[PDB]
């Protein structure tokens, strides 16, 4: 249009995920196009060519880590391009004046850190790709920061093609990271009204439940759920896991086939459990076969009740960790007294 660099975000499987929720620990497989086709067979002065050929990616450094060894420049046929290098700069102030002047002349402003891809030899780059109208594709994967997941928050990525010193902007690609915040309660039964005893008392030998509410995965998320587990390393000095637990959906779940599993539905059989009575730990994992059936357009959240017994006098704490695609999120810590 006619010189129209583009930027899209993709997941690992190559699905377009522009504007989608992206879980902490996920990778953004950004694809940048270097739009050269309109240049084919044109002639340009040596002087113009000497202004060089660059591609800037003003990536959101506060949120993402570049995965340097996944960054590739290819032509569209997939062939590796040599003669283009890339340099990350933590700021513009810290970049060569050559770079600062280049950007100023293209009227491009960047925020904090960015990447500059460079044609090492503008003459050979010209002859080989520009004159021949051979557009390129830059794969620039960048991974969400795990901590970001405690907070959530928007990030955006922006890019610029710079030919002959003229600058051309891609669209801005926006994503959001969900805040995942698991909760833990203490209850005597599964009744939905049952009293939270967090901060209260439990009798010796009383049977009770630790209720572990998982983090909420929002609709419109960017990739398959592979892992959603509840790991409860409880205090074996005061608590004994009786070997009974149940798992329930917390929301209506929409499957890929279009069916709906309603909120509160017993899904215990779509989970497995590891126990360890010695170190007092239990882990409940959804089966990956089940998780694979959830539509990317569905929210997801579950909760597990662990049947416990109080077996000593004293004050005992409990906290659980919800793992979501292998990132760990800790619940609040509950406390009861016997």
Instruction: Return the bridge partners of 85, or none.
Output: 118
- In the complex, minimum distance from the CB of residue 92 to Ca ion, in angstroms, rounded to a whole number: 10
Q: What CA–CA distance (Å, rounded) separates 279 from 236? A: 7
- In the complex, minimum distance from the CB of residue 114 to Ca ion, in angstroms, rounded to a whole number: 5
Per-residue binding string, Ca ion, 94-113, x by CB under 5 A, is: -----------------xxx
| Contact criterion met (CB below 8 Å) for 229 and 276 | no
Tell which one of 65, 156, 224, 233 touches Ca ion (CB under 5 A): 233
User: Which residue has its beta carbon closest to Ca ion?
Assistant: 280
Per-residue binding string, Ca ion, 155-174, x by CB under 5 A, is: --------------------
35 is in an annotated binding site: yes
Per-residue binding string, Ca ion, 134-153, x by CB under 5 A, is: --------------------
Residues with Cβ within 8 Å of 296's Cβ and at least 6 positions away in sequence, in order, are 220, 221, 222, 223, 224
- In the complex, minimum distance from the CB of residue 220 to Ca ion, in angstroms, rounded to a whole number: 25
Instruction: Return the bridge partners of 137, or none.
Output: 33, 74
| Burial group, residue 53, by CB count within 10 angstroms (0-12, 13-18, 19+) | buried
Site for Ca ion in 51-70 (CB under 5 A): 58, 61
177 versus 296: smaller Cβ distance to Ca ion? 177
- In the complex, minimum distance from the CB of residue 280 to Ca ion, in angstroms, rounded to a whole number: 3
Per-residue binding string, Ca ion, 275-304, x by CB under 5 A, is: -----x------------------------
- In the complex, minimum distance from the CB of residue 319 to Ca ion, in angstroms, rounded to a whole number: 11
Per-residue binding string, Ca ion, 20-39, x by CB under 5 A, is: ---------------x-xx-
Contacts of 144-148 with CB under 8 Å at 24 or more apart are 144/22, 144/23, 144/24, 144/25, 144/26, 144/27, 144/28, 144/63, 144/64, 144/177, 145/24, 145/63, 145/64, 145/65, 146/24, 146/25, 146/327, 147/24, 148/24, 148/63, 148/177
**The total number of residues written for the chain in this structure:** 338
228 is in an annotated binding site: no
233 is in an annotated binding site: yes
21 versus 58: smaller Cβ distance to Ca ion? 58
| Contact criterion met (CB below 8 Å) for 85 and 120 | yes
95 versus 261: smaller Cβ distance to Ca ion? 95
Q: What SS3 class is residue 215?
A: coil
- In the complex, minimum distance from the CB of residue 22 to Ca ion, in angstroms, rounded to a whole number: 17
Residues with Cβ within 8 Å of 289's Cβ and at least 6 positions away in sequence, in order, are none
Helix (H) or strand (E) holding 312: none
Helix (H) or strand (E) holding 43: none
293 versus 310: smaller Cβ distance to Ca ion? 310
19 versus 112: smaller Cβ distance to Ca ion? 112
Question: Could you tell me which residues are annotated as the binding site for Ca(2+)?
Answer: 2, 35, 37-38, 58-59, 61, 111, 113, 233-234, 236, 279-280
* Footprint of Ca ion (CB under 5 A): 35, 37-38, 58, 61, 111-113, 233, 236, 280
Question: Could you tell me which residues are annotated as the binding site?
Answer: 2, 35, 37-38, 58-59, 61, 111, 113, 233-234, 236, 279-280
């Amino acid at each position: 249009n006619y010189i129209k660099p583009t930027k899209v975000n993709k997941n690992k499987e190559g699905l377009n995920i522009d504007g989608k929720e992206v879980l902490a620990g996920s990778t953004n497989y950004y694809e940048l196009t270097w739009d050269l086709d309109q240049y084919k067979g044109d002639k340009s002065s040596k002087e113009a060519i000497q202004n060089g050929f660059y591609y800037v990616d003003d990536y959101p450094e506060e949120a993402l880590d570049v995965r340097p060894d996944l960054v590739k420049v290819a032509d569209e046929k997939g062939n590796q391009v040599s003669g283009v290098s890339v340099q990350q700069y933590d700021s513009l102030e810290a970049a060569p004046k050559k770079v600062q002047d280049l950007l100023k002349k293209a009227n491009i402003t960047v925020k904090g850190a960015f990447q500059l891809f460079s044609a090492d030899n503008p003459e050979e780059f010209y002859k080989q790709y520009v004159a021949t109208g051979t557009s390129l594709v830059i794969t620039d994967p960048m991974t969400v920061k795990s901590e970001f997941g405690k907070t959530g928050g928007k990030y955006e990525n922006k890019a610029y093609q710079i030919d002959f010193g003229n600058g051309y902007a891609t669209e801005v690609v926006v994503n959001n990271v969900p805040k995942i915040t698991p909760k833990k309660d203490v209850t005597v039964s599964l009744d939905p009204t049952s009293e939270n005893l967090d901060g209260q008392t439990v009798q010796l030998y009383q049977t009770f439940n630790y209720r572990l509410i998982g983090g909420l995965i929002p609709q419109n998320h960017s990739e398959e759920l592979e892992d959603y587990s509840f790991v409860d390393d409880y205090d074996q000095a005061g608590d004994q896991y009786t070997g009974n637990y149940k798992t329930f959906s917390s929301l209506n779940l929409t499957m890929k086939d279009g069916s709906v599993i309603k909120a509160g539905t017993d899904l215990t059989s779509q989970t497995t459990a590891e126990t360890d009575a010695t170190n007092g730990i239990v882990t409940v994992r959804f089966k990956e076969d089940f998780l694979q059936k959830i539509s990317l357009d569905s929210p997801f959240q579950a909760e597990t009740y662990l049947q416990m017994r109080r077996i000593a006098i004293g004050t005992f704490e409990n906290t659980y960790v919800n793992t979501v695609n292998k990132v760990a999120y800790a619940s609040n810590t509950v406390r009861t007294t016997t």
